[PDB]
Amino acid sequence: DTRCDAGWLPNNGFCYLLVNESNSWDKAHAKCKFSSDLISIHSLADVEVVVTKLHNEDIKEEVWIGLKNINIPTLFQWSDGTEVTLTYWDENEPNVPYNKTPNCVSYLGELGQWKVQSCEEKLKYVCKRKKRHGETCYKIYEDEVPFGTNCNLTITSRFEQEYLNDLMKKYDKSLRKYFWTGLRDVDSCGEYNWATVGGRRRAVTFSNWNFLEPASPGGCVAMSTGKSVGKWEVKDCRSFKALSICKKCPEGWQSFPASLSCYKVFHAERIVRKRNWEEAERFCQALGAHLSSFS
């Protein structure tokens, strides 16, 4: 519950804040090293914190991050710390020059990839102040021959797809393996929407298909990770062994017309058994009665 001062969003003790200043790499290294420290990526949730902030990420812009390298050959080490665990670079521009004493690195793109610019211009940056994901868990089973008998995985955004992708890549080490996603249709018409166990009517926002995946007017799609990693594979779901990850007043009447309806409620002590509005349709519907009708 660590709360910071007017803008620094916290996550597990520390908090971040983006500065609205456009300056070079040396001035940024001199400003937040303000009594602050530059940003360092160590987990998966902070990537979400960086992507959801930054004013729609300012798609056509770049963000700084402090990475230094003085000795040759190339050897990246953080300015404050040595916990090198996560590297998220663009595919695939390493931008590693021949030889240069000052090194720099920048968030590019909406996904938040890492690139190596010349850091001779002025740009914005972020600095700090002093399985599971952070809000929900993700469990996987040993074998799943049937199709979704215990869980039905549902996805909403692209970052959740990236998170499940890196989770399954940390789990998977070989090819020839399939997964399950919430995308199927039982009407055999062709419309594809976010599948569920009944009662799903949301509109599809994002989709990652291959060059030519869909060749069947139905079925339940899959997810492979051999070469086409992170994309939706299509295949029939009649009997297909594939695992899946699960996110873890005449007489005796009382009423009032202030709601334009005659009510009938009971207490919690004078009654025989605790009564609610659930099964009232078995008893009150004989008089044309329904739920609490307030305008």
Partner: protein, 294 residues
């Protein structure tokens, strides 16, 4: 002449009335009401002895009951006996044409508790007059067409003489007492008849032959009993039984009743016509617990 069993009378598409015959029933001549867009029969039009396989003889002599019996016995004749509504109406109209109250032939055995005709035929007709009139053990046909209970050891201006319980895995009971409780009559009956013996629920209809059985059992002590009660009351904002069980055999007359009151009158007809009557006064409870089916 609206007998309160087939018509709903309370605080209130044309309505037209007719007379219904029920194939020699003890309540012949009932008035029903329906839509008169259909076709029916017309029999009578009003402007300004042998009868129905029976024979009748009237004597205008003034004499007692046994004297009239001896007077009719010489010609092989027996005193009158009312067991059908048609012959009852004929006897009444003949008495009115004679303009007098004539003798009726019958006798009891034990202090006017078990009345019986002189033919030996099971009782199937009752047209008594009043309850607080049983002073003696004889009856006389009056002008209004009822049976005034008096002693016929008198001198009438004439006489007439004619010539021609365990059942289906359930046990019932009849209570003849006096009660005055006229409040909270929807949550006491179960605890009332449960104290008598365990496993005793209110009468529920789950078969089809119990109605005829209780109908044949009803006309045994119907001297002052004419209505039949039911166990259908206001339960769970609906018209159901007292126990926590749904209803299967519908007992509605027509349309769809929407009685929202805490109680009403579910009655059984003479033939089995399902009848519901909404009440505004509680002065129909005579007839609810004293001499009725509980």
């Amino acid at each position: 002449n609206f007998h309160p069993l087939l018509v709903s009378g309370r605080l209130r598409r044309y309505h037209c009335a007719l007379i219904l015959n029920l194939q020699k029933s003890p309540f012949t001549g009932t008035w029903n009401f329906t839509s008169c867009s259909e076709r029916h029969f017309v029999s009578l039009c009003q402007k300004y002895v042998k009868y129905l396989n029976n024979l009748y003889k009237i004597i205008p002599k003034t004499l007692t009951w046994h004297s009239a019996k001896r007077e009719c016995l010489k010609s092989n004749m027996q005193l009158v006996s009312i067991t059908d509504p048609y012959q009852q109406a004929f006897l009444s109209v003949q008495a009115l044409l004679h303009n007098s109250s004539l003798w009726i032939g019958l006798f009891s055995q034990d202090d006017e508790l078990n009345f019986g005709w002189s033919d030996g035929k099971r009782l199937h007709f009752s047209r008594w007059a009043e309850t607080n009139g049983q002073l003696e053990d004889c009856v006389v046909l009056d002008t209004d067409g009822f049976w005034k209970t008096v002693d016929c050891n008198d001198n009438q201006p004439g006489a007439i003489c004619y010539y021609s319980i365990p059942f289906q895995n359930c046990c019932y009971n009849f209570i003849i007492t006096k009660n005055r409780h006229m409040a909270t009559t929807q949550d006491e009956v179960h605890t009332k008849c449960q104290k008598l013996n365990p496993k005793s629920h209110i009468l529920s209809i789950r078969d089809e032959k119990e109605n005829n059985f209780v109908l044949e059992q009803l006309l045994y002590f119907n001297y002052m009993a004419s209505w039949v009660m039911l166990g259908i009351t206001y339960r769970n904002k609906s018209l159901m039984w007292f126990d926590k069980t749904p209803l299967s055999y519908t007992h509605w007359r027509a349309g769809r009743p929407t009685i929202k009151n805490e109680k009403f009158l579910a009655g059984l007809s003479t033939d089995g016509f399902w009848d519901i009557q909404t009440f505004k006064v509680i002065e129909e409870a005579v007839y609810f617990h004293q001499h009725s089916i509980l």
